[PDB]
């Protein structure tokens, strides 16, 4: 029986490890992203074809609600260091010009990762990101 724990307490720390890695990834993005024309920028086009060439590896490999908590947690990082950096570039949530932007480019990130398999109804709480 012990084999059920066997499995759900392996797949944990192969969850962890996933997440450090585009947690790597978000930072050295976003630490060298700029708001600018057009969208979705060269900056989340990367992003999201990343995580989309991780959601293929990995979904035939966990179960649903393990790639659900999987993506929410390399969201969580997602929003931590675009916060961060918004933060830095003085951007604010006030309905600006660059406001819109990045509100726009964002609005291509939730699109591309809803659309992912299991994904759809994620809690994603983007809104955390102008705090």
């Known amino acids: 029986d012990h084999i059920t724990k066997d499995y759900h307490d392996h797949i944990a720390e192969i969850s962890a490890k996933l997440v450090a890695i585009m947690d790597s990834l978000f930072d050295k993005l976003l630490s060298k992203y700029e708001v ?6 060269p900056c989340f086009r990367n992003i999201c074809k990343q ?28 929003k931590l260091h675009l916060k961060k950096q918004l933060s830095h570039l003085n951007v604010i949530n006030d309905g600006g010009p660059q406001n819109g932007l990045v509100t726009a480019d ?5 699109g591309n ?7 759809k109804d ?3 709480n983007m809104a ?3 705090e």
């Open 36 to 41: 600018k024309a057009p969208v979705p920028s």
């Open 51 to 78: 995580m989309t060439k991780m959601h293929e590896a990995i979904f035939d490999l966990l179960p649903e609600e393990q790639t659900q908590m999987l993506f929410l947690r390399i969201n969580a990082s997602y």
């Open 106 to 110: 964002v609005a291509f990130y939730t």
């Open 113 to 119: 990762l809803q659309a992912l398999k299991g994904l």
């Open 122 to 124: 994620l809690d994603l």
């Open 128 to 130: 955390e990101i102008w």
